[PDB]
Write a protein that binds this ligand. Structure first.
Ligand SMILES: Cc1ccc(NC(=O)NCCSCc2ccc(CN(C)C)o2)cc1Cl
Length: 145
C-alpha cells in the first residue's frame, strides 16, 4: 500500500502478511455474502494494483468464483481501453504514460508506474479504479451464489 507520513510524503510499503491472513480468513467465512465487499475495502486502504493481485492470489482456491471475478476484471479493462484508447507515447519526454486497462489491473504496469500514478498531484487513482472492478466482480458472485 501507499501511506501518507507526518510530513505529507507518500510512502510505499509491501502488503502486510497479517492483512493477507485476515483476508483469507474473511473469505473462508463470508465468500458468498455481501460483507466480503466492505471487508475487502477495509483490508485495501491505499492498496496498489500489485497489492490487490497479491490479495486475490491468496484466495484463488474456489476457481469458479475466481473465474467470474477475472471475467469481470477483463470486461472492465476492455471498457477502460474503449474510453481511453492508448496513444503511441506520452504528451512529452518526462511525462508518465496514461494507464491501460491491463495497467490498472497491474498485469502490464510495474509497481514503480503504479506508485507514480497513485502519488501524482492530484492522484491518478489506479488502485481505487481496480478496486471498483474487483467490487463489481464480488457483487456478481454474491448475487449468483
Ligand atoms: C468471492 C470469492 C469467493 C471465494 C473465494 N475463495 C475461496 O473460497 N477459496 C478457498 C480457499 S483458497 C486456499 C486456502 C486458503 C486457506 C485454505 C485452508 N482451508 C481450506 C481450511 O485453503 C475467492 C473469492 Cl474472490
Amino acid at each position: 500500500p501507499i501511506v501518507q507520513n507526518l510530513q505529507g510524503q507518500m510512502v510505499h510499503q509491501a502488503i502486510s502478511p497479517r492483512t493477507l491472513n485476515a483476508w483469507v480468513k474473511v473469505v473462508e467465512e463470508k465468500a458468498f455474502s455481501p460483507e466480503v465487499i466492505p471487508m475487502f475495502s477495509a483490508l485495501s486502504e491505499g492498496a496498489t494494483p500489485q497489492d490487490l493481485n497479491t490479495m486475490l492470489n491468496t484466495v484463488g482456491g474456489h476457481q469458479a468464483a475466481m473465474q467470474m471475478l477475472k471475467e469481470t476484471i477483463n470486461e472492465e479493462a476492455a471498457e477502460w481501453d474503449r474510453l481511453h484508447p492508448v496513444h503511441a507515447g506520452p504528451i512529452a519526454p518526462g511525462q508518465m504514460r496514461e494507464p491501460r486497462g491491463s495497467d490498472i489491473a497491474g498485469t502490464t504496469s510495474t509497481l514503480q508506474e503504479q506508485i507514480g500514478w497513485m502519488t501524482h498531484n492530484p492522484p491518478i487513482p489506479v488502485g481505487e479504479i481496480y478496486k471498483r472492478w474487483i467490487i463489481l466482480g464480488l457483487n456478481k458472485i454474491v448475487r449468483m451464489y
